[PDB]
């Protein structure tokens, strides 16, 4: 419900803004989910890791 | 001090045409590097058209 855009009231870029959003939330929370799947790989055991 | 036609049509109206053109270009700046509609292409931008 970000990219429901009758575009664009930014207009930046002409339908390229949310790419930066899920880009960056990919980036910051990536290294947190990294250790959260690495430490926390033991706490991601061979059960519902699937 | 006869002419006075031109003297403003020399000085005033010509520079007012020049700067009037300049502000008219400032009514087409639109702050976009770029975006457009362009039936054939991207055409980058509304600046162009």
As a three-state string, the secondary structure of B15-40 is HHHHHHHHHHHCCCCCCCCCCCCCCC
Q: Which residue has the tokens 């939330």?
A: A25
* Radius of gyration, alpha carbons of chain A: 17
Q: Which of residues 5-44 of B touch A (CB under 8 A)?
A: 32, 34-35
**Residue A20 structure tokens:** 């930066």
Contacts of A14 in chain B (CB under 8 A): 32, 34-35
Q: Is the Cβ–Cβ distance between B20 and B8 less than 8 Å?
A: no
DSSP tag of B2: -
Query: Residue A47 has what DSSP assignment?
Result: T
d(C-alpha B22, C-alpha A23), whole Å: 40
Spatial separation of the C-alpha atoms in residues A49 and A43, rounded to whole Å: 9
Q: Which residues contact B43 (CB under 8 A, 6 or more apart)?
A: B36, B37, B49
Cα–Cα distance measured from residue A48 to residue B3, given in angstroms and rounded to the nearest whole number:
95
* Resolution to one decimal, Å: 15.0
Cβ atoms A7, A15 nearer than 8 A: yes
């Amino acid at each position: 419900d970000i990219n429901l855009n009758k575009a664009t009231e930014f207009i930046l870029v002409d339908n390229n803004y949310n790419s930066t959003n899920e880009f960056w939330d990919g980036l910051m929370d990536r290294l947190s989910p990294y250790l959260s799947y690495f430490i926390d790989e033991k706490l991601k055991t061979e059960e519902d890791m699937i | 001090s006869l002419t006075f036609f031109d003297d403003y049509m020399n000085k005033s109206f010509l520079p007012k045409i020049q700067m009037t053109m300049d502000y008219l270009f400032t009514v087409e700046v639109e702050s976009n590097n770029p975006y457009a509609l362009e039936l054939s292409d991207e055409n980058h931008n509304i600046f162009k058209t």
